[PDB]
Subunit: 123 residues, 4 copies
């Protein structure tokens, strides 16, 4: 649900995710990573599927971060795809793809794959 | 580097991707899939890394589509991560993750992975 | 190391992995899954990279299971790619790809991706 | 279904895959990669699901290569998961995972994902 998703979240690496979910299925915010060629905050945009099902199914969603801001430019972008599971201990479980810009010759090694679990800090 | 990302692209399944790239890294537009539990257009939002880097590399980017619109709601979302290579034949080469909302019991099989190549042809 | 890998392992879903690592970099055994279109044991074969590094790096390895035996035929195969981290609480952390045989038309939805963590039962 | 899997296949990077399929689901052979920290041949072992199923589907299979031989040891392993489609032009369409051994600190970036298509041409 938008209200359930809106908030501050942290994952197992110690990275920060601040997001706002709008009535139209939109997600906007900033992300701070604890690892990598990154520093300060980066803007993020995504979408969430606003009418889930009733039942004890998760809400599917996804968002993107291009790793460029006023301080660093890493020439990469990461996308996270997953589901939001609410309750008293709400979580967002995801799998992600991190693509770096390469020459055609090294494109075979341009994408890393992983998984992150986020915990909401409420309050 | 960045540049002719704006436009109408098509992939090997016959899907249509219409996007506008803003000067500060944002991507907005609509997507229509030729397959799956989907019909008509859906809203997409993403980001690209303008630099990009001299050693003729691609420009990294990504975007998301939540499969809900006024015709269907498939309770899923797809994210595409890849890079744009411009030139005579411009291409956007991606890998995607399609997650459906499931119950805990079925969470082990909630995500499909695949790859799509887009051209303006 | 071969001795460190050889044994019985279980993952978060409650599935069983029995393996033997040979001196030549080989892995052979049986796998029993707690979920899916599966029943009884299935044969597995894989390889492990025998001379890791000294250091506190993991040993990379991978194995495959075709889901066909005398009782069921699911027309699928799963491959697990990951690393073995030994110590007192040894673990094998992986990401997997499960491909089902399809017609050309539905090949776009033939592969599922996930991650499993295995814990060794010693003794 | 299964059948002409045995043989010498090549993918879009120019790598060579030589395999033998046994009648009870086993796959054995050698692999030579045209890219990366690798040279000469490496041992591979895998499995395929013989049934396969009537609705002209592919045969599911997978195999593993640990990148260590008498010339190099790259401390990594790759697994390919996909399906074989025979016929006039037979193809093995796969997605792979390449994991390198890292320390805990770098475990978040230990795995690359990609896709390869093999032909006997
Ligand atoms: O190094 C880069 O290219 C930019 C930083 C990438 C950080 C990644 S995104 C996935 C994983 N989850 C995190 O919170 N950080 C790393
Ligand atoms: O069935 C669904 O869940 C919604 C439609 C999904 C269509 C997918 S997204 C990845 C692949 N590329 C496309 O153009 N369409 C399919
Ligand atoms: O349903 C099938 O096609 C065969 C069973 C698949 C079981 C999978 S493999 C990955 C995940 N890990 C497990 O232990 N079980 C599921
Ligand atoms: O550099 C390494 O770690 C060892 C060589 C890896 C070569 C990879 S495996 C997937 C892709 N397909 C190939 O034919 N070669 C590359």
């Amino acid at each position: 649900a938008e209200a359930g998703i809106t908030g501050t979240w942290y994952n197992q690496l110690g990275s920060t995710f601040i997001v706002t979910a709008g009535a139209d299925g939109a997600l906007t915010g900033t992300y701070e990573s604890a690892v990598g060629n990154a520093e300060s905050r980066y803007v993020l945009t995504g979408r969430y599927d606003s009418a889930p099902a009733t039942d004890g199914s998760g809400t599917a969603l996804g968002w993107t971060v291009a790793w460029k801001n006023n301080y660093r430019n890493a020439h990469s972008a990461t996308t996270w795809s997953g589901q939001y599971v609410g309750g008293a201990e709400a979580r967002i479980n995801t799998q992600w793809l991190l693509t770096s810009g390469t020459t055609e010759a090294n494109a075979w090694k341009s994408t890393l794959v992983g998984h992150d679990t986020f915990t909401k800090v409420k309050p």
